[PDB]
């Protein structure tokens, strides 16, 4: 019995490979060869957000592109006014071992989680003036690696128990659960229209999920090692992932395969975030080598370097209006580049 | 600046609270606590009193010890062990009355984040090991053991087999053998930590 199922799965994979190879009539690097290169992308540290006392692990921008939340293993989640460097809130976490945070698109809420397995939903707009936990979401069998709001009432989380889940923040319960990786779901990103999202897993595959139908819609592979970070191309028809294999890749949703690869012989450190600019033409990738590199996402060559940190960058993020790209690292200073 | 100075007052006030919390927390000593499954960890945690990470803590000779039992994580270490890069020492427990612990030590004590961080090694259940050696020889656990089947030598051989696994030369493995009734564990942890702290200070002074 079982051998037949294994053989049929193998044949299904060979049909996948045949179909994907048949569609590869030309490569992106070949098609876009005639496009003018984006040139030397010079950028300078307009702000430095001093005030964290231990390694920063996450950051996220408000939809207004001005407020930012940054969270570190000191046990504080702080909300910054990026235009003035003022600290708007400081939130004492109930446990110091944070690995992720998010800022709701309305700006009403902030979420956070880590080695606790629990994901906490802070309410920033309380009538009592202070900021308090409106809901503690519990149920994962391992650390929560990454989470994002779809809207104020529902948040999607990604965890070290091979599982992503979608929560109803009112009841505090899993409205849907996404089993299917062979390893940790290390990072996640909801698409621009939030109808579907991707997650990069520690089994080196990245999968495409439907948040209404609850099922895996496509599976992408090609890394040799764990995928530390991922996000969609702003059009929502492509996404790019960064591995501990010291390279980033661009995958296409409709062609079901990798379009281009970003690497250079002098680079051996793993990626820790990979985020596009508002046009999609730049892909900014943060590296364990303390550096951050900006890639021409079409021509696939180095546009420049955002070098300003004394320790690895743990996070990166472009504002919604594209006006700046923050970074945050383990030397406890966030920095705004523009 | 208009009512944009009251906002600046708030900014400075919570900056003050951040620093005041931080300078108070920097007095604590952080200790990652580890071992194989059921390797006696909980007993030294119990001697000191008080599904995710499990922080125990205790206070001794004006130090506050934060003592993280991380083993509740049902996931591979590599993707969260870099949280604990900043601990002062790693406390590693081995049950002599039990060998997976030895491979676990081989794996962690050479890990890229911990080549500079020292290990405190507790060989728990020495009394039960004395009982075991009286009834079944150490060769059952180590077929290459070439020596007398007596506690005072077999136990030291196990200690050597553990201490042989560190390949970086920037650390020391502070051993101890615990009979599980001892109250002295706090003092052992404390003065091992004092040695570790002065060694760190000698490195920070460039004198070492």
């Amino acid at each position: 019995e079982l051998d037949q199922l294994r053989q049929e799965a193998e044949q299904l994979k060979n049909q996948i490979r045949d179909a994907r190879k048949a569609c590869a009539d030309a490569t992106l690097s070949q098609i876009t060869n005639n496009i003018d290169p984006v040139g030397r992308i010079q950028m300078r540290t307009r702000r430095t957000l001093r005030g964290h006392l231990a390694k920063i692990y996450a950051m996220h921008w408000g939809t207004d592109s001005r407020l930012l939340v940054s969270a570190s293993q000191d046990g504080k989640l702080i909300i910054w006014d990026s235009y003035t460097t003022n600290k708007v809130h400081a939130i004492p976490l109930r446990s110091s071992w944070v690995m992720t945070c998010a800022y709701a698109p309305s700006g009403n809420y902030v979420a956070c989680g880590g080695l606790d397995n629990i994901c906490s939903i802070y309410n920033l707009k309380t009538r009592e003036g202070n900021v308090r936990v409106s809901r503690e979401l519990a149920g994962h069998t391992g650390y929560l690696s990454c989470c994002r709001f779809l809207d104020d009432n529902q948040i999607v989380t990604s965890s070290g128990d091979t599982t992503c889940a979608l929560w109803d923040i009112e009841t505090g319960q899993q409205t849907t659960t996404f089993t299917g990786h062979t390893g940790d779901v290390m990072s996640l990103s909801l698409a621009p229209d939030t109808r579907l999202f991707v997650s990069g897993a520690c089994d080196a595959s990245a999968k495409l999920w439907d948040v209404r139908e609850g099922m895996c819609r496509q599976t992408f592979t090609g890394h040799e090692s764990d995928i530390n970070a991922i996000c969609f191309f702003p059009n929502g028809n492509a996404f790019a992932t960064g591995s501990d294999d010291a390279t980033c890749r661009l995958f296409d949703l409709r062609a079901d395969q990798e379009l281009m690869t970003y690497s250079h012989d002098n680079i051996i450190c793993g990626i820790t975030s990979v985020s596009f600019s508002k046009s999609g033409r730049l892909l900014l990738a943060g590296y364990d080598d303390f550096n951050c590199n900006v890639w021409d996402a079409l021509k696939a060559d180095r546009a420049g370097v955002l070098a300003g940190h004394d320790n690895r960058v743990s996070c990166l993020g472009v504002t919604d209006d594209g006006m700046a790209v923050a970074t945050g690292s383990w030397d406890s200073f966030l920095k705004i580049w523009n | 600046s208009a009512e944009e100075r009251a906002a600046l007052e708030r900014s400075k006030a919570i900056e003050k609270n951040l620093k005041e919390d931080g300078i108070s927390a920097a007095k604590d000593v952080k200790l990652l606590l580890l071992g194989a499954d059921n390797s006696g960890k909980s007993t030294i945690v119990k001697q000191m009193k008080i599904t995710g990470i499990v922080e125990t803590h205790f206070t001794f000779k004006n130090l506050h010890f934060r003592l993280f039992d991380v083993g509740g994580q049902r996931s591979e270490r590599k993707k969260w062990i870099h949280c604990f890069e900043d601990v002062t020492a790693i406390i590693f427990c081995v049950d002599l009355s039990d060998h997976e612990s030895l491979m676990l030590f081989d794996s962690i004590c050479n890990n890229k984040f911990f080549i500079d961080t020292s290990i405190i090694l507790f060989l728990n259940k020495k009394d039960l090991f004395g009982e075991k050696i009286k009834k079944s020889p150490l060769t059952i656990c180590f077929p290459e053991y070439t020596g007398p089947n007596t506690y005072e030598d077999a136990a030291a051989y196990i200690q050597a087999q553990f201490e042989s696994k560190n390949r970086s030369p920037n650390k020391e493995i502070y051993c101890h053998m615990t009979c599980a009734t001892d109250t002295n564990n706090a003092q052992v942890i404390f003065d091992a930590v004092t040695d570790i702290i002065i060694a760190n200070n000698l490195r920070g002074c460039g004198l070492y």
Partner: single-chain antibody
Amino acid sequence: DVQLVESGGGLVQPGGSRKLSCSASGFAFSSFGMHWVRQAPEKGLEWVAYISSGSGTIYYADTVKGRFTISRKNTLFLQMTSLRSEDTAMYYCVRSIYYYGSSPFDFWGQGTTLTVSGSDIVMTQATSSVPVTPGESVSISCRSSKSLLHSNGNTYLYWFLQRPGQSPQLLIYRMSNLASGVPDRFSGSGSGTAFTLTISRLEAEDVGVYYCMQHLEYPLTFGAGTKLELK
């Protein structure tokens, strides 16, 4: 729920002294900056004193500096000395908190009646009262001697509604934003130096006196007040 209650009213001998106290509950008082505002027995509001979070800064109105003193156990105090005939008023304890997106002046205590035996930004409201009936739509306007639209882009006009027999409620803040819990019928408008609240589909619940206010700099100036009065 949020609550502020004050005590220490009644008759006082002119030239004497009195301490008025404000007791706060239901909110994180230490993090707010607290104001005092006073209403003369038949007239519009006038600002009295301010004390920030952590008591870092304190300000007083021109006719009050050094005669009163403000201090703040979840309790705030106004210490009054040499009470003049003019110092009789209902005194309101008003909370406020300042940070990006915050809403100052958003809750007002019930207030105590106390009675006794040129560079500042001036502000005017063009109409003393407007006759209006439910289902109609109405407009109330306000002007200032100096422009409120500051370099950082905000324009610091605030609008309050006082229903008869109530402490004022904040309706609009920084000239456009609608205060939480306020019905959507209200809207702010105008820019630079002249401002306008628009009421669409007015209701009997909107009958009252409307005060505009500047917050660009101290001393804070309230408008003379416009009574939107029924029929």
